[PDB]
Every structure is written in C-alpha cells, then in structure tokens.
Design a protein around this motif. Structure first.
Motif, PDB file in Angstrom:
ATOM      1  N   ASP A  15      11.841 -34.972  19.481  1.00 27.84           N
ATOM      2  CA  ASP A  15      10.426 -35.223  19.132  1.00 27.84           C
ATOM      3  C   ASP A  15       9.790 -34.082  18.348  1.00 27.84           C
ATOM      4  N   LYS A  16      10.639 -33.305  17.690  1.00 29.31           N
ATOM      5  CA  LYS A  16      10.228 -32.009  17.166  1.00 29.31           C
ATOM      6  C   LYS A  16      10.075 -32.041  15.656  1.00 29.31           C
ATOM      7  N   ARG A  17       9.052 -31.333  15.166  1.00 34.65           N
ATOM      8  CA  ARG A  17       8.657 -31.401  13.769  1.00 34.65           C
ATOM      9  C   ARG A  17       8.782 -30.058  13.056  1.00 34.65           C
ATOM     10  N   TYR A  18       9.109 -30.146  11.777  1.00 34.85           N
ATOM     11  CA  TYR A  18       8.865 -29.042  10.878  1.00 34.85           C
ATOM     12  C   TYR A  18       7.401 -29.052  10.450  1.00 34.85           C
ATOM     13  N   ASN A  19       6.912 -27.881  10.066  1.00 34.28           N
ATOM     14  CA  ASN A  19       5.604 -27.779   9.421  1.00 34.28           C
ATOM     15  C   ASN A  19       5.688 -27.902   7.897  1.00 34.28           C
ATOM     16  N   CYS A  20       4.584 -28.295   7.267  1.00 32.05           N
ATOM     17  CA  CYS A  20       4.562 -28.478   5.813  1.00 32.05           C
ATOM     18  C   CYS A  20       4.352 -27.142   5.116  1.00 32.05           C
ATOM     19  N   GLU A  21       5.161 -26.868   4.102  1.00 29.73           N
ATOM     20  CA  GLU A  21       4.967 -25.674   3.310  1.00 29.73           C
ATOM     21  C   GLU A  21       3.601 -25.706   2.603  1.00 29.73           C
ATOM     22  N   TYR A  22       2.917 -24.566   2.642  1.00 28.82           N
ATOM     23  CA  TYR A  22       1.604 -24.409   2.006  1.00 28.82           C
ATOM     24  C   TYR A  22       1.326 -22.935   1.786  1.00 28.82           C
ATOM     25  N   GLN A 100       7.998 -15.078   6.092  1.00 26.10           N
ATOM     26  CA  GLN A 100       8.626 -15.378   4.820  1.00 26.10           C
ATOM     27  C   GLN A 100       9.467 -16.620   5.007  1.00 26.10           C
ATOM     28  N   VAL A 101       9.156 -17.662   4.242  1.00 25.60           N
ATOM     29  CA  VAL A 101       9.935 -18.903   4.309  1.00 25.60           C
ATOM     30  C   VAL A 101      11.318 -18.649   3.727  1.00 25.60           C
ATOM     31  N   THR A 102      12.357 -19.107   4.435  1.00 28.91           N
ATOM     32  CA  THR A 102      13.715 -18.835   3.984  1.00 28.91           C
ATOM     33  C   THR A 102      14.522 -20.088   3.712  1.00 28.91           C
ATOM     34  N   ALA A 103      14.040 -21.238   4.171  1.00 28.88           N
ATOM     35  CA  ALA A 103      14.721 -22.498   3.877  1.00 28.88           C
ATOM     36  C   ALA A 103      13.745 -23.636   3.927  1.00 28.88           C
ATOM     37  N   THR A 104      13.942 -24.597   3.027  1.00 28.75           N
ATOM     38  CA  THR A 104      13.079 -25.761   2.963  1.00 28.75           C
ATOM     39  C   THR A 104      13.876 -27.028   2.697  1.00 28.75           C
ATOM     40  N   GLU A 105      13.231 -28.172   2.898  1.00 27.73           N
ATOM     41  CA  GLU A 105      13.781 -29.439   2.400  1.00 27.73           C
ATOM     42  C   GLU A 105      12.658 -30.447   2.156  1.00 27.73           C
ATOM     43  N   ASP A 106      12.892 -31.414   1.276  1.00 28.04           N
ATOM     44  CA  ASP A 106      11.843 -32.371   0.907  1.00 28.04           C
ATOM     45  C   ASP A 106      11.338 -33.185   2.096  1.00 28.04           C
ATOM     46  N   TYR A 107      10.031 -33.457   2.104  1.00 28.49           N
ATOM     47  CA  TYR A 107       9.444 -34.449   3.017  1.00 28.49           C
ATOM     48  C   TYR A 107       8.833 -35.531   2.150  1.00 28.49           C
ATOM     49  N   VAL A 108       9.157 -36.782   2.460  1.00 30.18           N
ATOM     50  CA  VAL A 108       8.612 -37.900   1.717  1.00 30.18           C
ATOM     51  C   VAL A 108       7.750 -38.739   2.645  1.00 30.18           C
ATOM     52  N   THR A 115       5.843 -36.492  -2.134  1.00 27.81           N
ATOM     53  CA  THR A 115       6.725 -35.472  -1.570  1.00 27.81           C
ATOM     54  C   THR A 115       5.927 -34.263  -1.101  1.00 27.81           C
ATOM     55  N   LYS A 116       6.251 -33.803   0.103  1.00 29.44           N
ATOM     56  CA  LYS A 116       5.840 -32.501   0.592  1.00 29.44           C
ATOM     57  C   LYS A 116       7.123 -31.756   0.955  1.00 29.44           C
ATOM     58  N   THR A 117       6.982 -30.614   1.601  1.00 32.05           N
ATOM     59  CA  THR A 117       8.130 -29.749   1.819  1.00 32.05           C
ATOM     60  C   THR A 117       8.142 -29.299   3.270  1.00 32.05           C
ATOM     61  N   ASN A 118       9.226 -29.607   3.986  1.00 34.59           N
ATOM     62  CA  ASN A 118       9.468 -29.024   5.319  1.00 34.59           C
ATOM     63  C   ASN A 118       9.832 -27.561   5.217  1.00 34.59           C
ATOM     64  N   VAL A 119       9.168 -26.757   6.036  1.00 37.74           N
ATOM     65  CA  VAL A 119       9.631 -25.401   6.288  1.00 37.74           C
ATOM     66  C   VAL A 119      10.765 -25.468   7.313  1.00 37.74           C
ATOM     67  N   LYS A 120      11.995 -25.304   6.828  1.00 31.24           N
ATOM     68  CA  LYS A 120      13.177 -25.457   7.682  1.00 31.24           C
ATOM     69  C   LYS A 120      13.494 -24.207   8.497  1.00 31.24           C
TER      70      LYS A 120
END
Ligand SMILES: C[C@H](CCCC(C)(C)O)[C@H]1CC[C@H]2[C@@H]3CC=C4C[C@@H](O)CC[C@]4(C)[C@H]3CC[C@]12C
Ligand SMILES: *[C@@H]1O[C@H](CO)[C@@H](O[C@@H]2O[C@H](CO)[C@@H](O)[C@H](O)[C@H]2NC(C)=O)[C@H](O)[C@H]1NC(C)=O
Ligand SMILES: *[C@@H]1O[C@H](CO)[C@@H](O)[C@H](O)[C@H]1NC(C)=O
Length: 225
Positions: A15-22, A100-108, A115-120
């Motif tokens: 049930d766990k989420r990434y946050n959106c890059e901003y 410091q963000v070190t990995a991301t992936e697309d969120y649709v 498209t937004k971006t997950n902070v992975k």
C-alpha cells in the motif's frame, strides 16, 4: 528555499507510495492539514506554513507512526527526535539543502495520461550530532513489559549490534517492508559538496519535550535514575 518533492505519486509496493518529484518553492499548507501538522511537526506550524509536503503526505506519515510508537511511546523525548527526522525529510521548506534525488521513474495519471515523476530513491544528509543524539535518547528505552531494549525491535538486528547510523540506515531501507522507498543516509556535522546536513536541535530522554510532556522514566533512561 526549494523542495525535492511534493505530494504522492505511484505505488512502490503493497500500500506504499512514492512521492512526486518537484523542485519549486514550498507551498502554504491548506488549512485542512493544520491538525496533522500541529500533531506531527509543530515546529513547522507558523506563518504561512509553507512546506514541501501536502496533506496526503502528512496523513501517510501519521499512519506509519504505529510501529515506532509501538516500541518508543513511553519515552516522549526519544520518539520526538525520531519524529523530527521524519518531519524534516517529509516537509522541510529547505529540503534541497539536505536531500538529493538519486533515482526516478515516470508516473502516468490513468485518466489524463499526464506524466509526473516518482522519486524512487534519494540521499538524506543527516547531522552526525543529530543521529547520535537521536540514538542516545532512545538507547535505554525498554520494550513495554520486558527487560529488553526497544531498539532491538526497530533496528533489524539485536540491540547489542544496533548503532546510531545503522539504525537510521535500517529504518530507511525499503527492504524492511515498512519504508515505501529507500533513503540512503549520509552522516556529517560538516557540509558535503554544498549540502548542509539536517542538524535540528534534539531533546535528551532526561528533558521534557514540552510543558505537558514529562521526561522519560529511569527504566527507559539511565540519566534520570
Ligand atoms: C515508521 C518507519 C520507521 C520504523 C521502521 C520499522 C521497520 C523499524 O518498523 C519510517 C521509516 C521511513 C519512514 C518514511 C520515510 C518517507 C516518507 C515519505 C513522506 O511523504 C510520508 C512519510 C514516510 C512514508 C515515512 C513514514 C515513516 C517511515 C516508514
Ligand atoms: C528544525 O529546526 C528549525 C530551526 O530551529 C525549526 O524551525 C524554527 O521553528 C520555530 C518553531 O516554530 C520557529 O519559531 C522558527 O522561526 C523556525 N526557524 C527557521 C529557521 O525556520 C524547525 O521547527 C525544526 N523542525 C521541526 C520539525 O521541529
Ligand atoms: C546519553 O548521553 C549522555 C551524555 O550526554 C549520557 O549521560 C547517557 O548515558 C546517554 N544515554 C542515554 C540513554 O541518555
């Protein structure tokens, strides 16, 4: 002042989420989050309450407090510094100084296809003094109705192997099945390539958190004995 994230994006696991890059400035929190912010991170509760988190993130932070509370609730100072570690990560209007963000992936977005971006994954610059004080305030806390140390249940190892930095590294590792995504901590009392580590003031277990919250017991805090 600048953020690295804002709001929740896609599912990581369970049930766990990434946050959106901003990467913009912090935003004044809606009034409907004022109860949560007062409860969780009262240090931020002033002025326009401009934060790098939204109400959803604060609710998620509250919901995730159950296991730390399970083992640390009886010693408010110990729990307080831990809460502040998470408050700073989640909401600080100066996140960009120590994250410091070190990995991301697309969120649709399923409906709009925007498209937004997950902070992975990200790296969190934590004060050495902060980490040591957080550990020091918690290291004597007994698990409720036991003669064992509470850290043995929150550290992924026995209490005799738990240390300040490995405790924080464990909590922040998604392999623990609780953290929604991994945060890699770097511990320093000194700036690191321009990053200014989070080194908030801390309370010892012998101190009151506030006017209505007493110090910890002798059983949980050998200083007060
Ligand atoms: C409650 C646990 C600590 C205890 C873990 C364990 C396995 C010992 O019980 C902590 C570790 C990491 C924390 C999260 C870090 C990042 C975020 C993102 C933010 O937007 C919302 C809060 C949240 C999910 C933190 C919640 C508390 C977490 C899981
Ligand atoms: C981390 O420490 C900072 C610095 O002391 C705290 O920010 C201050 O909070 C107080 C209490 O509301 C305000 O009066 C100050 O104006 C704030 N100063 C700055 C520079 O922002 C912050 O509250 C602490 N974080 C948490 C989560 O408690
Ligand atoms: C914390 O450090 C203090 C010295 O600053 C020491 O008295 C104490 O034993 C340590 N441990 C705890 C649980 O407070």
């Amino acid at each position: 002042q600048s953020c690295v994230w804002y709001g929740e994006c896609g599912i990581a696991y369970g049930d766990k989420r990434y946050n959106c890059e901003y990467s913009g400035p912090p935003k004044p929190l809606p009034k409907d989050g004022y109860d949560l912010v007062q409860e969780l991170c009262p240090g931020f509760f002033f002025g326009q309450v401009s934060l790098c988190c939204d109400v959803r993130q604060l609710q998620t932070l509250k919901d995730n407090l159950q296991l730390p509370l399970q083992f640390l609730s009886r010693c408010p100072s110990c729990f307080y510094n831990l809460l502040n570690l998470f408050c700073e990560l989640t909401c600080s209007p100066r996140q960009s100084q120590f994250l410091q963000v070190t990995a991301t992936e697309d969120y649709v977005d399923p409906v709009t296809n925007q498209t937004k971006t997950n902070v992975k994954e990200l790296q969190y610059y934590v004060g050495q003094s902060f980490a040591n004080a957080m550990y020091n305030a918690c290291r004597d806390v007994e698990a409720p109705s036991s003669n064992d140390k509470a850290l043995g249940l929150l550290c992924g190892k026995d209490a005799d192997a738990c240390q300040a930095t490995n405790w924080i590294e464990y909590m922040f590792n998604k392999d623990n099945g609780q953290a929604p995504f991994t945060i890699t901590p770097v511990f320093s009392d000194f700036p690191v390539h321009g990053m200014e580590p989070m080194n908030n003031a801390t309370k010892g277990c012998d101190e009151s958190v506030d006017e209505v919250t007493a110090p910890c017991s002798c059983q949980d805090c050998s200083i007060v004995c």
